[PDB]
């Protein structure tokens, strides 16, 4: 219908418990040790175990 009252000050946080941000899956390079994503091309190295992948 209509919100019967204002949501009191407890329930703002007690809702927003499950509103976190998560970043996961970060690992060092094979060439510079920078904490980059598993199963992902390094933006600075550009390698899958010793390959000039991003190269011309």
């Amino acid at each position: 219908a209509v919100p019967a009252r204002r949501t009191s000050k407890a329930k703002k946080a007690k809702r927003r418990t499950h509103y976190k941000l998560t970043i996961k899956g970060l690992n060092a390079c094979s060439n510079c040790g920078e904490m980059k994503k598993s199963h992902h091309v390094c933006p600075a190295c550009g390698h899958y175990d010793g390959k000039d992948v991003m190269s011309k």
């Binding site: 976190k20 941000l21 980059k36």
Partner: protein, 112 residues
């Protein structure tokens, strides 16, 4: 000398709800953790808090301290900047309020 340089970002054209999420994920970590986490974010804070940390590092170098790699983000803030107020015509000829917001953001960098 004295430790704990600081740097402030002012009039940041976003919300606080969309910024306090990101600075759940920084407080308690070192500098090498910090830029590493911030490079892989799908959000607006990436362009912001990174340059805040870079200025914090340059203020730790050029003015106060040494040992750049042994610095810890102790605390940080996102605070409610001055808003901006404009309107949009809702249907049936009447009006409706729609906000725009800013924020003021600070980050505290102690040594250890």
């Amino acid at each position: 000398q004295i430790t704990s340089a600081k740097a402030t970002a002012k009039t940041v054209r976003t919300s606080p709800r969309k910024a306090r999420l990101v600075i759940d994920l920084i407080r308690g970590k070192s500098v090498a953790d910090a830029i590493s986490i911030l490079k892989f974010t799908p959000n607006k804070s990436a362009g912001i808090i990174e340059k805040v940390l870079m200025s914090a590092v340059a203020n730790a170098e050029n003015n106060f301290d040494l040992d750049v790699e042994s610095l810890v983000v102790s605390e940080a803030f996102v605070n409610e900047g001055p808003t901006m107020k404009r309107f949009r015509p809702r249907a049936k000829g009447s009006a409706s309020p729609i906000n725009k917001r800013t924020s003021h953001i600070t980050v505290v960098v102690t040594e250890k």
